[PDB]
Amino acid sequence: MDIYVCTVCGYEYDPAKGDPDSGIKPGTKFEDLPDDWACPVCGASKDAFEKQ
Ligand SMILES: [Fe+3]
């Protein structure tokens, strides 16, 4: 289960934590984020993330 990192700002999307503020429950894999999901810290698109 992969952590993904925002190439713009360095925020880490952690699947074990999800992103409740965006309606993403804990345990949601990166692949299951919608394409309109954005980095909570900098606003960059999901497609700006890379696998850590
Ligand atoms: Fe970011």
Curated annotation (Swiss-Prot):
GO terms for biological process: alkane catabolic process. Fe cation binds at C6, C9, C39, C42. PROSITE patterns: RUBREDOXIN, RUBREDOXIN_LIKE. Keywords: Cytoplasm, Electron transport, Formylation, Iron, Metal-binding, Transport. Its cofactor is Fe(3+). NCBIfam families: RubredRD. This is Rubredoxin. It comes from Megalodesulfovibrio gigas.
